[PDB]
Every structure is written in structure tokens, then in C-alpha cells.
Design an enzyme around this catalytic site. Structure first.
Site, PDB file in Angstrom:
ATOM      1  N   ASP A  15       0.848  -1.202   0.000  1.00  0.00           N
ATOM      2  CA  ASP A  15       0.000   0.000   0.000  1.00  0.00           C
ATOM      3  C   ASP A  15       0.887   1.257   0.000  1.00  0.00           C
ATOM      4  O   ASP A  15       1.851   1.307  -0.765  1.00  0.00           O
ATOM      5  CB  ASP A  15      -0.987  -0.052   1.178  1.00  0.00           C
ATOM      6  CG  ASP A  15      -2.007   1.083   1.162  1.00  0.00           C
ATOM      7  OD1 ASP A  15      -3.049   0.927   0.486  1.00  0.00           O
ATOM      8  OD2 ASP A  15      -1.775   2.112   1.861  1.00  0.00           O
ATOM      9  N   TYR A  21      -1.758  11.257   1.519  1.00  0.00           N
ATOM     10  CA  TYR A  21      -2.622  11.470   0.355  1.00  0.00           C
ATOM     11  C   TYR A  21      -2.688  12.956   0.054  1.00  0.00           C
ATOM     12  O   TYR A  21      -2.866  13.371  -1.095  1.00  0.00           O
ATOM     13  CB  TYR A  21      -4.053  10.973   0.618  1.00  0.00           C
ATOM     14  CG  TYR A  21      -4.209   9.481   0.770  1.00  0.00           C
ATOM     15  CD1 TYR A  21      -4.435   8.665  -0.336  1.00  0.00           C
ATOM     16  CD2 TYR A  21      -4.158   8.889   2.025  1.00  0.00           C
ATOM     17  CE1 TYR A  21      -4.606   7.291  -0.185  1.00  0.00           C
ATOM     18  CE2 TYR A  21      -4.324   7.529   2.184  1.00  0.00           C
ATOM     19  CZ  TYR A  21      -4.542   6.742   1.085  1.00  0.00           C
ATOM     20  OH  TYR A  21      -4.690   5.393   1.278  1.00  0.00           O
ATOM     21  N   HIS A  45      -7.526  -6.526  -0.343  1.00  0.00           N
ATOM     22  CA  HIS A  45      -6.426  -5.564  -0.273  1.00  0.00           C
ATOM     23  C   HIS A  45      -5.320  -5.915   0.740  1.00  0.00           C
ATOM     24  O   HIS A  45      -4.129  -5.756   0.451  1.00  0.00           O
ATOM     25  CB  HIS A  45      -6.983  -4.174   0.042  1.00  0.00           C
ATOM     26  CG  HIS A  45      -5.934  -3.104   0.139  1.00  0.00           C
ATOM     27  ND1 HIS A  45      -5.373  -2.507  -0.972  1.00  0.00           N
ATOM     28  CD2 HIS A  45      -5.359  -2.514   1.215  1.00  0.00           C
ATOM     29  CE1 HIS A  45      -4.496  -1.596  -0.584  1.00  0.00           C
ATOM     30  NE2 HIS A  45      -4.466  -1.580   0.737  1.00  0.00           N
TER      31      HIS A  45
END
Lengths: 320, 305
Positions: free
Chosen positions: A104, A234, A299
Site C-alpha cells: 500500500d 494522500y 487488499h
């Protein structure tokens, strides 16, 4: 293998911040970089397994997470800061090279680490997120907005405070629902001012790979830190894009084994599977070995398919 | 072989419009000027190297001359600057280039070599040697501690201030270009054989148009650059380098630099560094002041490749 009690915990100053490092074993270093919203703890099974095979397993909490320092400014969370931390950490280990394993956001740090200082990385096992070549025609968040609209999760992660509020308004339950999510495709939130579908449904029961003790550990750390540190990664996507202009059309020369579940949100987002199967991935990463796709895995594949992942890591790195 | 035979054009690189001057055909020799200079500073090398069968290419860097000058200070980090030059190299359509640089251009050049060494066959570096990142202290903080608030780089930090201070821009440039004073340039508050009023006028014309803000903005990012380049702490340059400096250069005579070079530390960080060239009686602008020798020094190095 061993017990969690045999894992050593310590703090190291790296790139101007105090970093928590967990580690076990002696031998060549295997360095693990977790993602969002996770911890060193996400690698617990691989730490035990790789140390039992004669490797020194090392897994830090990344900048902004767990027991690692969380700088106050959003601007301290660019890709440059993140890779800087990991380079400092590698140098603190007293070794010339490490094997690298990441997942990730940690895998994104890992890609730029492989670009910036390839001589430090013998081989890379990359989970979930493949290399993403820089698009110089459009900023990443802009492109996400043009493709998925304003409610795409990363778009909604941009404004300070909002995603924090959207979640926390019980961090244990929030972490649990994120970790146990199996919905494929782009995560698209409802319009702003509309409740997340989650809050109308009972919390889903734990899957076999995730215990209550696990959820408790995660919650203990995120109760203190909140999600801000992780979310700030982010919030630097567009700045990262400006800052990485020098690597347009760059190639990763480190050998890579890429592994994903087929239900992974990333894998089932537009472009990614095409990027992999078109040969574009191999073009950008010429020493990419055969891609591993894990049937019926979502995920969080280092946790969900923990044993298979520990095995894949060992089978790859023992080759070097 | 005549200034007028030099081709001029504009190319879009890394989101900005860049003015590019070029002459000749053959392997690219890319030139990067410094502060407060222009493509024009390489005039003699451009003619000389094109006359030897190389394609000499020399842009105005971001913020300078006829190249776009973005308004935001934060658009002048080392990451933007190297980004511009990588894009420029890619637009030339060749695989590798020979790199020649000076002053702030040499700093761009060093990070270019670190970031994308595969694009650089060899590097001829003028005036500014490689500088290993110091993790203990930020660069401008260190300058202020060493030299105090009137040290020029410290004075350049606050926006507007240096501009107002330097506010006849050609006389300003004339005094910078002809300077030969030794040591830490500390601020207050006839022409040498190699520089003509013609040259001064060209510079004055371009900087009358642009101002000095673009170039000063490079200095205003020194501390941020430091934060952004932590991944290169202890990194080594893997490109062959020829370093050349005048012996009156303020950098060369600054604290610890000659030692960095003589101790072999420079050689440690740049393992394919060739023989350092020290030009007697030459000050900071060695490309202009010793134009012929620099041209020959470039030719003799890059022909080995």
C-alpha cells in the site's frame, strides 16, 4: 516459529524524527514498510516467519503512525520526507543493502526508494500497489477527479479534518471495517453530508485472519495518533507530482516480485490490471519477475494470506 | 563562428516555456548557466564546441532571460529545476548528453547526475563542487551561524529585499561579473579584457525585462531543498566528472572547500572524478574569463567518451 514477545522494540532518530522499529532475527535484513491505515504490526506473521529462516526482520511504524513521531505540518509528509526517513533508517542498521517488502502506501515509498537509491535494495517484494509512472500532463488528484468525480475517496481525503471527522464520527470499529472490507472497485463515498452506508449496518464479524486482540492493538495506537498522519500522505499527492518531475519516464532497475489479491481495490481500479497485463509494468520495471495474483484475496494480503505471503517472500529473496 | 548563426527557439519542458539557444550537429553538449547569468554566458563555448562537431545546447534556466519565470517562490526548488532539465534532455530526442555547468547551474547539474545518471555521459563541472548533504544543520541556518545576517545568501532570503537593494540593473550586473574580492560576500545595509559593454548591454537588456527575482528564488529554496534531498544523504555520484575552478573563486576559497577537494573527500563522493583543474588568477566566472581554456578543457574531456 517464535512468539510476539520475542520481537524487539526500539526507537531510532532518522531524518530528524524518532522512529519506532520492531525487529527479530539475525542475518540479511528484510525491511517491511506498512500502508494505510496500518502499523509495523501488520507484518507480525512475516516478522516471525522470516526471522525463523535466518533473516533479520525489521518493520518500522512509518512517519505519522503508531509510536513513530507525527510532525505537525502537512508539508512534512511528501514522498521526499518519507523516502528520506527510510534511507536514514537503512543507514542506521549498519548494513549496505536490504531486501525490501512493502504494501500500500509503504509500497509507494518503496518504489521511490528503489528509484532514488537502488544500490541499497537487493530485491523488492511489492504488495498491492504496482509502479505508477508519472503522468506529466495532469496532476494525480485532478485526474482522479476527472475519472471518478469529487466523491472518490482520495479526492475526499484532501481537505484537512474532513475524512477524520467522517470516520471518527470508536476508532477500533473504524479500523476494523476498513481492514475487513472486501468490496472491489474504486471506493466512491456518498455525497458530502450523506451518511456512510457503514453506520446503517451492524459491524461485520471478523474474518478468520483477524482477531479481536489484533483489532485491540490497532485501536490502542490509532486512539492516540488519529488518522491525520496517515491521511497526510494522500494530501501530498499533487505536491509529490511536482517534486518528482525528474523521474518522468524513469525505470526501476531493482528486481521485483509483485503480489496482489484479485479483490484488491487497487487491482480492480481502472487501468491497473491493464497496466500489468499490457506489459507496461514490465516496461517500467524491467527486472519484474512473474506477477502473483491471489485468488479470492482482497487488499490486506500480507494479513489475509499471511502464510502464502511469508512463503512468497522467502522463495524470492533466497534467490539473491 | 558568428553569434548570428546560433539558433534560438522555445520548447515546452516540465510545464514551462524554455528559451533554448543551440548550434552545431553531433553529440549534445548541454550547458547550464548560473546566477545572475543567461544562455549568453556560454557564447564562446557554444561557438567553439559546435566548430568541433558537437551539438551545443544552452537554455535560459527557469526564471531567467527569455524562459518563463513562474511567480511562486516554491516553484524554484531543486526538484523543479532538475525536472526542467530532464524534460529538456528528453525533448532533444537523444539518449545521453554531455553536461557542462557553472554556479547554480552546476548545482542543478550535480542533482541531475544523482537523480538520472543514465542521461549523463560525462559532466564538466565549473566553480561549485559536489556538496554532501549535512544532516545536522540546514544550509542557510549554517551560513547565518558562520557569516551572520549580512552574508549575501541570508540577505537573499526575505522576498523583495534583495530586489529593492539591487534596484540601472546593468551596472549591478557589471559589478557582480567583474568582482574579484575574496571571502564571504557580506552586503551593506573599467571592464576586464573578457567582458565588453556589448556583453553588459545584452545582460542588462534581459535582466531589465526579467528582474532578479527568478534567480534569487533559487537561494530562497536552499532550506526546503535540504528537507527534500534527505534521501541522498551519503549518496555517491556515478558519472565521470571533470571539475574546473578559478583560484580566486569565492567558493574555492570558502571555509573547508579546498580541504574537501585536497583531502580526497570530493573524490570519495564522486568516485569517477578526474584531475581537478585549478586556473591561476581566475575568479568566479571562469567560463567567460578563461573562455578558450574552458572550451579546450571541455573538448579534451568529452572526447574520451
Amino acid at each position: 516459529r517464535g512468539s510476539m514477545e520475542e520481537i524487539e522494540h526500539r526507537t531510532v532518530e532518522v531524518n530528524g524524527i524518532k522512529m519506532h522499529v520492531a525487529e527479530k532475527g539475525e542475518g540479511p535484513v528484510v525491511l517491511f514498510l506498512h500502508g494505510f491505515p496500518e502499523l509495523w504490526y501488520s507484518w507480525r506473521h512475516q516478522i516471525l516467519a522470516l526471522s525463523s529462516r535466518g533473516y533479520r526482520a525489521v518493520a518500522p511504524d512509518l512517519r505519522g503512525y503508531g509510536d513513530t513521531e507525527a510532525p505537525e505540518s502537512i508539508s512534512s509528509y511528501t514522498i521526499m520526507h518519507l523516502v528520506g526517513d527510510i534511507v536514514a533508517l537503512i543507514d542506521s542498521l549498519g548494513v549496505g543493502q536490504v531486501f525490501l517488502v512493502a504494501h500500500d502506501w509503504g509500497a509507494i515509498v518503496g518504489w521511490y526508494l528503489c528509484l532514488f537509491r537502488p544500490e541499497k535494495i537487493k530485491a523488492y517484494v511489492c504488495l498491492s500497489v504496482p509502479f505508477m509512472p508519472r503522468n506529466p500532463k495532469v496532476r494525480p488528484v485532478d485526474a482522479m477527479r476527472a475519472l471518478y468525480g469529487d466523491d472518490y475517496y482520495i479526492c475526499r481525503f484532501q481537505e484537512p479534518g474532513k475524512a477524520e471527522a467522517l470516520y471518527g464520527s470508536n476508532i477500533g470499529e473504524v479500523i476494523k471495517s476498513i481492514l475487513t472490507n472486501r468490496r472491489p472497485g474504486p471506493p466512491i463515498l456518498p455525497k458530502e453530508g450523506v451518511a456512510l452506508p457503514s453506520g446503517s449496518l451492524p459491524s461485520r464479524p471478523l474474518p478468520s485472519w483477524l482477531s479481536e486482540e489484533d483489532v485491540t492493538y490497532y485501536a490502542s495506537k490509532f486512539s492516540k495518533t488519529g488518522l491525520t498522519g496517515g491521511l497526510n500522505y494522500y494530501r501530498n499527492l499533487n505536491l509529490n507530482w511536482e517534486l518528482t518531475a525528474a523521474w518522468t519516464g524513469a525505470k526501476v532497475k531493482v528486481p521485483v516480485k509483485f503480489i496482489t489479491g484479485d479483490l484488491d481495490v487497487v487491482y480492480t481500479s481502472l487501468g491497473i490490471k491493464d497496466y500489468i497485463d499490457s506489459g507496461a509494468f514490465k516496461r517500467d520495471v524491467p527486472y519484474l519477475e512473474e506477477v502473483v495474483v491471489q485468488e479470492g484475496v482482497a487488499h490486506f494480503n500480507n494479513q489475509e494470506a499471511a502464510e502464502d505471503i511469508s512463503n512468497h517472500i522467502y522463495e524470492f529473496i533466497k534467490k539473491f
